[PDB]
Write a protein that binds this DNA or RNA. Structure first.
Ligand SMILES: [Mg+2]
Ligand SMILES: [Mg+2]
Ligand SMILES: [Mg+2]
Ligand SMILES: [Mg+2]
Ligand SMILES: [Mg+2]
Ligand SMILES: [Mg+2]
Ligand SMILES: [Mg+2]
Ligand SMILES: [Mg+2]
Ligand SMILES: [Mg+2]
Ligand SMILES: [Mg+2]
Ligand SMILES: [Mg+2]
Ligand SMILES: [Mg+2]
Ligand SMILES: [Mg+2]
Ligand SMILES: [Mg+2]
Ligand SMILES: [Mg+2]
Ligand SMILES: [Mg+2]
Ligand SMILES: [Mg+2]
Ligand SMILES: [Mg+2]
Ligand SMILES: [Mg+2]
Ligand SMILES: [Mg+2]
Ligand SMILES: [Mg+2]
Ligand SMILES: [Mg+2]
Ligand SMILES: [Mg+2]
Ligand SMILES: [Mg+2]
Ligand SMILES: [Mg+2]
Ligand SMILES: [Mg+2]
Ligand SMILES: [Mg+2]
Ligand SMILES: [Mg+2]
Ligand SMILES: [Mg+2]
Ligand SMILES: [Mg+2]
Ligand SMILES: [Mg+2]
Ligand SMILES: [Mg+2]
Ligand SMILES: [Mg+2]
Ligand SMILES: [Mg+2]
Lengths: 150, 201, 261
RNA sequence: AUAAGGGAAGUCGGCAAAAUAGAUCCGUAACUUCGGGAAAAGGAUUGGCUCUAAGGGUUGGGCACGUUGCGGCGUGCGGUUAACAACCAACUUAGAACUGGUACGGACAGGGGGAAUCUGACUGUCUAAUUAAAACAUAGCAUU
RNA sequence: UACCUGGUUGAUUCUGCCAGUAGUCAUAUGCUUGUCUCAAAGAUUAAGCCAUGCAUGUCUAAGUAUAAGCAAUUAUACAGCGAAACUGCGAAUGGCUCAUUAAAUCAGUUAUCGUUUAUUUGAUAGUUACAUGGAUAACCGUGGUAAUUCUAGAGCUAAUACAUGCUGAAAAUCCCGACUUCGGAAGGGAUGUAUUUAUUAGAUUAAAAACCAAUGCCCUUCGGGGCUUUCUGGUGAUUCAUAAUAACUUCUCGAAUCGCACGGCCUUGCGCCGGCGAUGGUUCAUUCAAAUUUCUGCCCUAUCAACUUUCGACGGCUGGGUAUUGGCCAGCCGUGGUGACAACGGGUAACGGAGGGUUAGGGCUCGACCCCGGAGAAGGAGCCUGAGAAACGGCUACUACA
RNA sequence: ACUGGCUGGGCUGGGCCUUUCCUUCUGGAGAACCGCAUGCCGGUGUGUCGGGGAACCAGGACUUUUACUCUGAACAAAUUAGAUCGCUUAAAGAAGGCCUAUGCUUGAAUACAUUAGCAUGGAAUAAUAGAAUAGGACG
RNA sequence: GCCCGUCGCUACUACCGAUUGAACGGCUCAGUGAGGCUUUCGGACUGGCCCAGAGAGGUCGGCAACGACCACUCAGGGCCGG
């Protein structure tokens, strides 16, 4: 994503329980132990994006550098709206079977998901989302990977 | 009474839902308690499952911890100076989580004097009003204390200016309405500079 | 519905209890205990409906008040006590011991056992970790918690319990080539040898077994209960859980009938 | 100028008088030449005091040499301050707490409204000194 | 059992409907009625109104007995049964009905690394004491009101009711240090658990060196050749399980309870030790669960085509509140969200499902009703106790009946 | 019941060479083919032998993506179809049976649901992606 | 032969229609507003102490030197609770 500055708000944004002002300086390989940026891996064969490790953004809803765990269903779709702030709308299409007439018809549903600043999402793209805990009135999924363009 | 269910809301398509059932024993809410600085006053409340919570109506002291060394001493809170949510909270001087306050620095200065045998933030030398010396009863203490000073280091210039006046900025990190305690830490460094930069302009 | 339930309607009881649809409207409604409600063996149903020792409810509840019957070496006095897999029930006055195990048709059956072998059990482990104070412990499928176990023991394994001192004498690893009996699903009563296991990341793995008669079947890991590597430690009931199909079942039924008379 | 209770029972006839009235925010029918009707009808708020937030102007930005007595220049050649620093200036709008004999467009200033019929389309004009109207004129139409 | 017949014309062949025919665990009604096995039944119109009676209480050897209670006569503290009463538990399960309700309930399938949990079951907690203190019921005796499961004041006594309260161990860790020869040391304090905040550890999983700073050492010929090295669990995934440090708290828990057995020691004191049960008790695990939650699936109607954000409608942030997440709520900042693949609205003589009726196959129609889930107790709201209720055979208020 | 067959005819399936045949590394135990000497009636234990790993197991990486179909898993009692037993037959029921027993023995099955969700094999039919300003593949 | 329409009589069904027609029900602006949870003062009534000490009396031991304790009345002050 494109963010001009990291601290542009009323309060001060910082990762919880990450001590940042220590008199003695110690260099450690562990992400959160030494006092530098903390991050984790979700799993299910999903690789942490490179921009996350060195980025400066603060987000408490990103599966990476956040306090949200991913568990439940994993779904895929096409983005139809991405013009609001840090949230996108995807469109899913399927086929319903009518038993009497022995043929199908198309149907669709709309879904809301939270998008992290690590990814860059444009209109008409394939995304893969995973279930999470309720984050808002109608947001229960998080994007994990953006498939390459045709 | 107060309810926190989503039935009375409006669906994401804009449709209006219909009446389903009367209010339930769960999904209840309670009147907020506005903590203020004053003589201590706390009420007990019997919550779900037979447990209890503690409503704090007036508080005057709580634990605050100094970061780098790691010592925490109990002292009193003078007043609230900033609140990211609402200014009226500041003017009424009511304190909640993430409230910037001013705290007495005396216990921490005394502990610093005991741990390191040097004075911190003393510009009263112009007055020479309270100069006093007590003979220190040892010689191993200078090598141990000077070892601490030569190893740990020295305090940044910003914090002594705060110590001369005797007031320190802190942030409440507890929930006074829930736990009945006001706790926090002394804030310093670049996060401190953020607050002084925002506080007076 | 304004609290927990305390009545159970007949025609809703578990099928493997084999309760007649007539002669009453209610069922024993087993009390809370160490075993799951869905698959348990109430003491009143076992004593009255299978052994036929007690004619009806009134003296059925009298029997436990005399402290005649005990399970796992400890006397139980409640009529609706949930018994389960592998538990040992001992009646000293008549002088025999029983073990509850599924038959090949998916229901509990009476099974005499000898006294010397009727003084130990074995159960699958559910979780292992260290508790308060740093003391390691594990809990099995029958709500047995044991502290200071062998550190090599992991989850999904099975452990032999003395039942008098609760000490870990021996254990069986969970790997290919072991002998297992199924405890849940439609495959009730089968016994097989682990052939190979395939795992799915994200939960709900499946395991493939192979019977002695070259039959093949699969089941979830939550339903497999390993009882040995070779020469299973416990004594299997008659038929060994082989699940003959109906064609030979009728052939053997007539063959046995003509052989006897 | 004011009047208890009733509120047009007075009278040819509500003649005279009373009631409504500023500003801000909601709400607004039949009908229609689609421009109106409409300020339709009908509701709420309004003082004093102590605060918070928003709406502007002016002057400053790198090296490399040469005249003129640290400076105006003459030039050549880079970067767009993740917009900073100082000073100056009137008013208009929104929000919060406390306060009072529940009062606050406190004097002045300041629309009564609705359902229908007859008649002239409208704005306009005339009997100065008893009649301002349905009378006259008007645009449009038609004829010689 | 994959089936048809009568009716337009003077007569004929067609489209086409009217009529006939059969079933119904589908209701009403007429005439008639001997026996055997089984037995539905004020749902439809009025979720309209009710006289009367009943439908929820409970004691063991083991909480409290001075019954002017009975019964015996081993118990001069009692000792059997046991009215009344305090205390504990249950009364939130059952039973009835279908008024409301059109993505709501519900069904199959997921999640809780987002919560509460009586009880049952299994483990688990070393900082005056040979026994602490005031009330109260039952009871005696005296009253008020036409009236109720209404109650006053006076005199007594109990707890598993209420309120207090006792380092019996060592070791280890962290701070202050009286006192020197400067290289360690006398002795002083803290240290269970619950609650709240900050900080630290919670390792990796291929190998070979050479320098600076400077110190446990073995051998030793004093030139030194040198130096191998002890632990760390789990998940697909975390700030997980768990440990340590500095402090905090109108603040918890760590047993002043009860019944059977009659035993063993020598310094023989009314000395010490010793079994099995009941009732309780902190945390973890389990069981019965409960509350939220992912995906897909509901009748007719366009003479319903645009809807939602006054006073939350879509999203971001800081908090409050709740058992917890969440526009559930309070402030600040963006302008979004659904729709012809039928949104939004109006009808329903609409509780949903498992399922009933009728058959070549495909279908049409019904489902108040014994099984599962949801809701209600004349209509609305509010609440105490309790683990659990927005309860009505619980209370408060209004309207209508009485 | 039933054995060889028949150079029988079909049918299903599994291995190689045809320009194609079938991804890859680590570790486990270990076969087949080989000889070494020690012992019997041209084969073998032999082992504390190694040249050697058919197949198998566990772990990691790579593999266009949907629809479709086959086989599994998970899913309620009642109901429907349906097996057994002469309640004197039957609608029902889940019972009962055996010489004579102070005893023994069995059953209380099975299939379907079908929409959505989870795995496995097949690769026709119907869609989708890829090297053209090379921004392509390999060492 | 079949057959079309106005007008007159009788019977039935629906439609337009002055009357700001009438009755019943649902959702809503505004005004008035019972009850209750939470909260701020209040303290009917109650309990516990500590001192100083009025006034009197007793107790057990001490020759004594001295200790300790228990009953009455008026209390003085407090100074903390529910
Ligand atoms: Mg019920
Ligand atoms: Mg999982
Ligand atoms: Mg008047
Ligand atoms: Mg008047
Ligand atoms: Mg009037
Ligand atoms: Mg008159
Ligand atoms: Mg008149
Ligand atoms: Mg007038
Ligand atoms: Mg008006
Ligand atoms: Mg008008
Ligand atoms: Mg005002
Ligand atoms: Mg006015
Ligand atoms: Mg005119
Ligand atoms: Mg005139
Ligand atoms: Mg005039
Ligand atoms: Mg004219
Ligand atoms: Mg004819
Ligand atoms: Mg009815
Ligand atoms: Mg009624
Ligand atoms: Mg007794
Ligand atoms: Mg109905
Ligand atoms: Mg317990
Ligand atoms: Mg108690
Ligand atoms: Mg939040
Ligand atoms: Mg759109
Ligand atoms: Mg209805
Ligand atoms: Mg029904
Ligand atoms: Mg209810
Ligand atoms: Mg109620
Ligand atoms: Mg009743
Ligand atoms: Mg009831
Ligand atoms: Mg039959
Ligand atoms: Mg109102
Ligand atoms: Mg009020």
């Amino acid at each position: 994503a494109t963010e001009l500055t990291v601290q542009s708000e009323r309060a001060f944004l910082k990762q919880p329980h990450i001590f940042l002002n220590s008199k003695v300086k110690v260099k450690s390989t562990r992400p959160g132990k030494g006092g530098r940026r903390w991050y984790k891996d979700v799993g299910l064969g999903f690789k942490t994006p490179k921009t996350a490790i060195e980025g400066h953004y603060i987000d408490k809803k990103c599966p990476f550098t956040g306090m949200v765990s991913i568990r439940g269903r994993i779904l895929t779709g096409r983005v139809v709206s991405t013009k609001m702030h840090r949230t996108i709308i995807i469109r899913r299409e399927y086929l319903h079977y009518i038993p009497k007439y022995n043929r199908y018809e198309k149907r669709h549903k709309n879904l809301a998901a939270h998008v992290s600043p690590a990814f860059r999402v444009e209109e008409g793209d394939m995304v893969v989302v995973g279930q999470c805990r309720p984050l808002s009135k109608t947001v229960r999924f998080n994007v994990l990977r953006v498939l390459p363009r045709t | 009474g107060i309810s926190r269910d989503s039935r009375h809301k409006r669906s994401h398509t804009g449709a209006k839902r219909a009446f389903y059932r009367k209010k339930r024993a769960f999904e209840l809410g309670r009147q907020p308690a506005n903590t203020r600085i004053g003589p201590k006053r706390i009420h007990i409340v019997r919550t779900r499952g037979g447990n209890h919570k503690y409503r704090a109506l007036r508080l005057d002291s709580g634990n605050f911890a100094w970061g780098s060394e790691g010592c925490t001493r109990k002292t009193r809170i003078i007043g609230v100076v900033y609140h990211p949510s609402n200014n009226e909270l500041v003017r009424t001087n009511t304190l909640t989580k993430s409230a910037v306050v001013q705290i007495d620095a005396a216990p921490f200065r005394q502990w610093y004097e005991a741990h390191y045998g040097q004075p911190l933030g003393r510009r009263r030398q112009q007055k020479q009003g309270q100069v006093v010396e007590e003979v220190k009863k040892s010689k191993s203490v200078e090598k141990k204390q000077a070892a601490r000073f030569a190893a740990h280091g020295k305090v940044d210039p910003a914090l002594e200016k705060q110590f001369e006046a005797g007031r320190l900025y802190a942030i409440i990190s507890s929930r006074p309405g829930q736990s009945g305690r006001a706790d926090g830490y002394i804030l310093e460094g670049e996060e401190l500079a953020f607050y002084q930069r925002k506080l007076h302009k | 519905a304004r609290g927990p339930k305390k009545h159970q309607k007949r025609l809703s009881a578990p099928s493997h209890w084999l309760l007649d649809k007539l002669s009453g409207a209610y069922a024993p409604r087993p009390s809370t205990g160490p075993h799951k409600l869905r698959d348990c063996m109430p003491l009143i149903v076992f004593v009255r409906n299978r052994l036929k020792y007690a004619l009806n409810y009134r003296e059925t509840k009298a029997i436990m008040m005399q402290r005649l019957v005990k399970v796992d070496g400890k006397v139980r006095t409640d009529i609706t006590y949930p018994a389960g897999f592998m538990d040992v029930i001992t009646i000293e006055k008549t002088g025999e011991n029983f073990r509850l195990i599924y038959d090949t048709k998916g229901r509990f059956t009476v099974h005499r056992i000898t006294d010397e072998e009727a003084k130990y059990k074995l159960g699958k482990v559910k979780r292992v970790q260290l508790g308060r104070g740093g003391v390691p412990f594990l809990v099995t499928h029958d709500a047995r918690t044991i502290r200071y176990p062998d550190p090599l023991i992991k989850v999904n394994d099975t452990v032999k319990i003395d039942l008098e001192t609760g000490k870990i004498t021996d254990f069986i690893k969970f790997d290919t080539g072991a002998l297992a009996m199924i405890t849940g699903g439609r495959n009730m009563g089968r016994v097989g040898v682990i052939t190979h296991r395939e795992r799915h990341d994200g939960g709900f793995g499946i395991v493939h077994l192979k019977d002695a008669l070259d039959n093949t079947f699969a089941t979830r890991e939550s339903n497999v209960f390993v009882i040995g590597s070779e020469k299973p430690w416990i004594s299997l009931p008659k038929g060994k859980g082989v699940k003959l199909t109906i064609a030979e079942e009728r052939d053997q039924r007539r063959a046995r009938a003509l052989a006897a008379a």
